[PDB]
Amino acid sequence: DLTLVAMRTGREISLPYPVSCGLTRTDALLQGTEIHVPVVVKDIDMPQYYNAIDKDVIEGQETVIKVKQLPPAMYPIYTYGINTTEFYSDHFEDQVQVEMAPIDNGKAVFNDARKFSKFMSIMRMMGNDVTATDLVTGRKVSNWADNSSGRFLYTDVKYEGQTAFLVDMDTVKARDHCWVSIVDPNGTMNLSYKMTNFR
Amino acid sequence: MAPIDNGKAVFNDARKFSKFMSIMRMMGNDVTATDLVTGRKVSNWADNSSGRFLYTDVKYEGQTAFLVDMDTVKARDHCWVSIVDPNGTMNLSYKMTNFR
Amino acid sequence: MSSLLNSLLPEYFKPKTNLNINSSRVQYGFNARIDMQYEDDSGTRKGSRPNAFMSNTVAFIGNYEGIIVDDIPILDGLRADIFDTHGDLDMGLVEDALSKSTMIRRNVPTYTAYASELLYKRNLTSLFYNMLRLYYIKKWGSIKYEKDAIFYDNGHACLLNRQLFPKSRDASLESSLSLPEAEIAMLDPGLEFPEEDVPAILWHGRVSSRATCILGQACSEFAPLAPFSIAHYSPQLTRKLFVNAPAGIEPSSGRYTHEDVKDAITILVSANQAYTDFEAAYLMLAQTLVSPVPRTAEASAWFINAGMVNMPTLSCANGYYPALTNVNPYHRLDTWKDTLNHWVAYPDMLFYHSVAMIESCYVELGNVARVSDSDAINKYTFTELSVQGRPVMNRGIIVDLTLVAMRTGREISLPYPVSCGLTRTDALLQGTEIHVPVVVKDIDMPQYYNAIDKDVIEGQETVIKVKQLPPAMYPIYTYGINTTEFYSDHFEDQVQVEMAPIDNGKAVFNDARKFSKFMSIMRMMGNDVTATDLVTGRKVSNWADNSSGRFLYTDVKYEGQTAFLVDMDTVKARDHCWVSIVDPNGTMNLSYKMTNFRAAMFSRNKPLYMTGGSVRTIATGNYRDAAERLRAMDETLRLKPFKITEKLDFRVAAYAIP
Amino acid sequence: MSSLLNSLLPEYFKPKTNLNINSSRVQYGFNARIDMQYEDDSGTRKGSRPNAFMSNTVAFIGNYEGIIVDDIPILDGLRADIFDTHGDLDMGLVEDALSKSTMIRRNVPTYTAYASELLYKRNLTSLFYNMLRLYYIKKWGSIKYEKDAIFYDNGHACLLNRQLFPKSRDASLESSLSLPEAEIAMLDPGLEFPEEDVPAILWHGRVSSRATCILGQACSEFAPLAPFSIAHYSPQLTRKLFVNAPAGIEPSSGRYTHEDVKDAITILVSANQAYTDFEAAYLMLAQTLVSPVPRTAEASAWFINAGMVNMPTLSCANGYYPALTNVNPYHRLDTWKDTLNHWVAYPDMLFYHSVAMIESCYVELGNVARVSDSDAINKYTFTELSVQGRPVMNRGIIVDLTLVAMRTGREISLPYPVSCGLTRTDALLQGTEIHVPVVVKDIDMPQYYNAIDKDVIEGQETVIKVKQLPPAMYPIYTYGINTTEFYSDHFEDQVQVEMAPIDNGKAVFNDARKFSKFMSIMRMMGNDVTATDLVTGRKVSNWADNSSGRFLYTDVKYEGQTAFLVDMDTVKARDHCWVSIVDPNGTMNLSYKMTNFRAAMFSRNKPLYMTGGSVRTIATGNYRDAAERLRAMDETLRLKPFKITEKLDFRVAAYAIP
């Protein structure tokens, strides 16, 4: 636990005695096997999003989700922009440039995985419900997959494969309050934000 | 060359897809790919008269990703250069002489 | 040792990750372009072979037997403090190391006494060997062995799988073995006296239901039905195996996927710090995995008698004393985790490393067999002069790695002098003619082969005599890295020979070297010439091997001195380029160039294509944060190469120190 | 002393830790390449044996009998304060030391009075000796002894195990002894007056359940059934043994392994500070671990009567005076812990140290038996002039160490002049005829051997009269380090036999020296020569051994005038790899050359290989440099970080060191 803190802050932690007592967290990681978490369903269109065991499930049924790679359990908040990585993208200033031509009728394909993550994340700050669909596999991902942080990490796809995300920009829905509207875009889009003060 | 997973190679970029099918045509390999957005089959052997591949043979303005069928690569016209299984970075250098 | 066997592959070839093997036979070669130029007294002629396929054939069939022997301990993974200023294990410091890392100090005198006896016999190489074999049985578990199939087939003679492998039946690879399960018990912490002749191993967290079944079957006896390379007979490793797991082990499931065996190996190595033990097992499997299909019928003499695989005894004392294994392990080389990191990333790459190793051994044994038994370096005393360490016995891997050094001409070095694996030089080290059993296909068989019965009928089972062992394989991957006169595997070469006077329709070739050069030219032009050996009275043919398009002098099948009567009237035209002429006149000059190499693999008379992505390099430098190279070149194994010095005889080979 | 016995081993010999002995007979030796030559007026005939095996057979049987004798006290261990300037117990500082301690005040005056007698009872050599024998009995317990087995056989004469060892039943070494346990009582600290004639020892913490069983059996009578060397007859050391352990003595377990005996020794030496006592016990066992199988039939005279082992009486008064032993002991030599530290690390090395000592002794007693009594340094007075100390009696280890000093040609130094162990020079000093029994095979025996009967039918039990004792072992480990002309153990040697054509093969050797070299070199060449003495009329054969393959002059079995007729048309070729003497004419010149040496061991007519780690030369400095180091790295858990680095893919993470 102390060696993980040393990696986060980026400093040298020193104790007087090399004592080895307390909780061990790295248990499910080192096993390197599939884990079967139980879930009770609410809607009927669940198993498209989550990697479920059943393909058709009536509401109020107890199902199982197959988790292979462990997603992050917490988002950095106290350690925000002290040792920044491009995965979490916990910057004060950030921008993304999605390049579209008028010949394309709103439909954009993200060949790159990095800028797809930043587009889907900044659109959620702006209070827009985007629903992308993978062209190779045929699954779907939604940027609204959290009600705490309000960011989109790439591990919300729940699948490691080839990157071909079709996003249709005439099915974008305004969900939250205090939001900027994308009524009908034409040409190159440039999104950007700035965090100024903290309380 | 894109990684061949089962018997299919995903070409996400547009420029790389144009260069790939342009090489395989000069070697003389009738390759058939599936456009993932539309769901229609493209073929590099569209025009027989002029022995070249233009990107307009896809017949879809806009952005897409192609799933190339690497198992069903037919051998129409074979010179000694002609290979079926590409591996890594493909280099083709040709010279045209003796016009009449 | 990944970096060693990876170097053997040719510079042009870089193989992809996956390879879907779906048969018990794989051809491997290259498609080269030959530009021949002919000149004689009549005039000049220029041609060009546009596509020429030179290939060997390798199979998954080889009769092997396991023996449990006592070998050296691998002292890698133990904490660095117990070792003194030199590279030696001091029992004075083991007492201190165990004392400081406990509150209960009553048990220190007892713990030290048992530890001193067990540390000098620690070896997990035999356990990883069986775990690796279980991985490949599950992965390639759809390969069929038919009993009434062909082994070698030329046209005159034939060998079936009934012969060479009696006591065999028709079975798939998954159907070959029905392994039992050894008792995987839990070591409760509190037991004071380690039970003797039972090893104890560490584990990360809870032992999975699937991990139990793998460890149970890995320790059990292997009893095959069909002869397979990766299912050979092995004795029982242990009866019990303790596992010091804080969380209790689960009962055995019964079934497991090939993916589950990877998870079992990755945990077992990481916990025990047994990285060098894995490197030994990796090299040990590279020898066994594949076996050569013989070039000619005489080259079946190698694979009659069952070669012995020396499996080290399974012992480990990490479970009892987990204080000795800590966060600061002792290692001799800084590149000591490369072999595992290579396998876990690219499992199917072992096939290419195995083909590269067995080729290098069986090519160089072609030369060692021809060495006269009245020189400094001969078949008996070639290993002993080469090695510069202190192993238990010059057996197993030491013999194989000595032949790789002689091939490549570079100094090979391992951290520990391990003597574990297959010994090939058994048929070689005996002054006796070997009786290869064969089947007669054509009535004129006794004229070609040295048969017992001089009159035969199509269908009869006879026996042929082999005195000197011919080469089993031709150089393909190791083509032109160092060229001997025997093989003549040049890129560019100018062959010059003087044609003998054609009296009636026959040309007498009294000299041995001139005869070899003549038939070598006529083969490259593509003329099937047949000559009569005057001493024996048997017919030789340059078209002996179709796969590799070259002529070796061992195709005559007569050690000693002779004169050949070549039939110049009956020169058939099998393959004709524009260079190809039938009537040579005076001094024959042939100058050829080989360009445009490209690797190709065939399986079941169709092209076998490589799948997956491109292999990115994984490799660690000589230093991580180490200041001074403390040489420590006393215990490390070193193998010195020998260079072949050609002499006038041509039939005899001779080695010298470079 | 591990140091002096280590130097006796050859330079080419590189020993390993473990040696898996599974029999009661070992043929230790070396493989050498002999280049023999026979020059003559007609021409030269060259030979070459690439692997020539020169061996000395060593067994685990030998009749010995222990007797309890009075020996000097060993004062190493006691605190350095009580000693004066000269180095003897200054009584007055003892009374001062006891007064300023944690002793009961009413016991001080009565205990101080006894000190004058009890403090000079310090000799634990007998206890350590018995505890070392228990270690090797349980380790090599599976070795067998058959009653009707062949002790010696040379074709003509045979000597069975029934002949030398009557009252002998066939049994395994483990099943030989049935040791009864002596009482191990706890010393009451509040005892009125110390009980002399009852030894009291110290212990660290609690006496374990197994330590009671080991100490109980160590201080008991050895009454064996089979005549084994490490299970010979010993009297009862003591009836009762006190142990000053505040933590109570647990009752006897009954069973124990060989590892538990090492635990018992290491606690006993550390508590009592008795390292010099252990060094004496190590050298004692080195003599009487293995006995040599006789080279010739008439060399069995050494092992007819049982040689007495001198075990010093068990006497220790540390239990009564705990204050006088502390962490600052008095020692003469600085390297006083080296012998124990060597044994704890490498227990099985004692086998090599044992054969080195007996081979050194029995070689020198060979060429000591061939000196006339009328001389300065002779049979009786070779020990007195060599010894420059003050031992009680010239017996035990003093006689064996002085013979080693003569062999190697160096000065052997011990800290205390202790006189305990086996005495070998018994049959020599008697100077009388010895009557060895023999069972005959052929009917023409009594011409060769000096037998009691002149006509004896096959299968009869006869007697041979041995007057002068022949050498029991040939020098092998000490080959060409201190060469004498008797053994003729040179690397290069030649002999010139001068004959004229007028003589029809018959040569008479007037000289005795060159007759020995001719007969010896002819046996290397594999030729069976049979000479006949002209004066007496007896016969000698060069083939009188199947181990070394040399001819010593003591094989004549008679001292007289030298006139040996050898007929050189009755020479028969016996062995393989031999040069032929078909028909010689003129002067003969024989010669050989030994070039290289490789250590080899045989057991049950199979190769015995050394396994385990590489044995080093342990020095006092190699451990105490790690004490100087102390691991001075302040024991503070400093965790260093890793900065994550992003690259093209971004899906997978990569950590850097800085």
Residue numbers in the entry:
A (entry chain A): 400 to 598
B (entry chain R): 499 to 598
C (entry chain B), D (entry chain A): 1 to 658
List passages from the publication reporting this PDB structure.
L-BC virus persists in the budding yeast Saccharomyces cerevisiae, whereas other viruses from the family Totiviridae infect a diverse group of organisms including protists, fungi, arthropods, and vertebrates. Totiviridae is a family of viruses with monopartite double-stranded RNA (dsRNA) genomes, which contain two open reading frames encoding the capsid protein and the RNA-dependent RNA-polymerase (RdRp). The capsid of L-BC is organized with icosahedral symmetry with two subunits of capsid protein, named A and B, forming the icosahedral asymmetric unit. Decamers of capsid proteins are stabilized by domain swapping of the C-termini of subunits located around icosahedral fivefold axes.
Furthermore, we identified an open particle of L-BC that lacks one decamer of capsid proteins. Three-dimensional reconstruction of the open particles, with imposed fivefold symmetry, produced a 10 Å resolution capsid structure with one missing decamer of capsid proteins. The opening in the particle has a diameter of 16 nm. Overall, the structure of the open particle corresponds to that of virions and empty capsids; however, fifteen capsid proteins, two B and one A subunit from each of the five decamers that border the opening, have smeared densities indicating their high mobility. The three subunits are located further away from the particle center, and the B subunits are also shifted away from the hole. The total displacement of the border subunits is between 9 and 11 Å relative to their positions in the complete capsid. The icosahedral asymmetric unit forming the border of the opening contains fewer resolved residues than those from the remainder of the capsid. The structures of capsid proteins from the empty particle were fitted into the other reconstructions. The domain swaps of βU strands between A subunits related by a fivefold axis and the existence of open particles indicate that capsids of L-BC virus are assembled from decamers. Furthermore, the open particles may be assembly intermediates that are prepared for the incorporation of the virus (+) strand RNA.
